[PDB]
Design a protein around this ligand. Structure first.
Ligand SMILES: C[S@@+](CC[C@H](N)C(=O)[O-])C[C@H]1O[C@@H](n2cnc3c(N)ncnc32)[C@H](O)[C@@H]1O
Length: 234
């Protein structure tokens, strides 16, 4: 049972024991419109094989990764493996990857995956290069899991852009799992709350407990410092 291919501090692989038992009954379509590492998407596909899965993110480089893992896994794994073999100095690997700009999907996928493994917590901007990540997270064992990951996600629909599209796309027995950037360009929580109120599907939001979040989502069901916010009774 594959848990994670990507490292995110706000990853939900540990929260699954709380999330999975509280999915709505009979959902046939799963949407993750802010997928990031997609712990929940990976878990749902492995526990419910007949569900249609749609994942989305605003982060173009992250979506290049997911599309290239789905569509081009052999080439992606081989290029990542070659770079791991050739760049024995992690700081020089970092400097090489961070100095690249632009690229097609494949180049973006390779760069995104390796930066995810060699950074402090998965991103350049939130702690930069970590020698500890380079030695203990950028491992053959993590690379080895990409082939199984590519198999799990083969029939995923994958898009880049705003979460609104998957909120409002018509469909039947749709469940939407939302894990926004934590509550403080920064994420517009007011726009999010405004759009989710009009979402015609069943949804669950994960937020850190805050009075500001309790107030913004007073209209909804809040369950207990982590919150599950839903429009269906658990
Ligand atoms: C807390 S992370 C969710 C990660 C996911 N739960 C996991 O297991 O890794 C929030 C995500 O929201 C994405 N995001 C931010 N603004 C967005 C937007 N307007 N539309 C879609 N995704 C967005 C970020 O790129 C980030 O990947």
């Amino acid at each position: 049972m594959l848990k994670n291919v990507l490292r995110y501090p706000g990853g939900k692989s540990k929260a699954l024991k709380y999330i999975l038992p509280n999915l709505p009954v009979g959902f046939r379509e799963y949407r993750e419109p802010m997928v990031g590492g997609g712990a929940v998407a990976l878990a749902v596909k492995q526990l419910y094989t007949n569900v249609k899965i749609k994942i989305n993110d605003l982060n173009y480089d992250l979506i290049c990764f997911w599309k290239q893992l789905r569509d081009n896994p052999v080439q992606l794994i081989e290029e990542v493996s070659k770079i791991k073999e050739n760049y024995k100095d992690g700081r020089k690997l970092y400097e090489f990857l961070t100095s690249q700009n632009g690229g097609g999907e494949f180049e973006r996928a390779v760069r995104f995956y390796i930066l995810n493994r060699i950074t402090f917590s998965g991103t350049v901007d939130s702690g930069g290069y970590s020698q500890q990540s380079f030695e203990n997270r950028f491992t053959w064992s993590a690379i080895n899991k990409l082939k199984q990951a590519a198999e799990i996600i083969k029939d995923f629909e994958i898009s880049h852009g705003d979460y609104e599209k998957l909120l409002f796309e018509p469909g039947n027995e749709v469940f939407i799992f939302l894990d926004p950037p934590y509550y403080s360009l920064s994420f517009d929580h007011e726009r999010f709350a405004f759009n989710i109120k009009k979402c015609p599907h069943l949804w669950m939001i994960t937020y850190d407990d805050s009075p500001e979040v309790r107030k913004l989502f007073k209209f909804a069901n809040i369950y207990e410092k982590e919150l599950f916010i839903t429009n269906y009774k658990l």
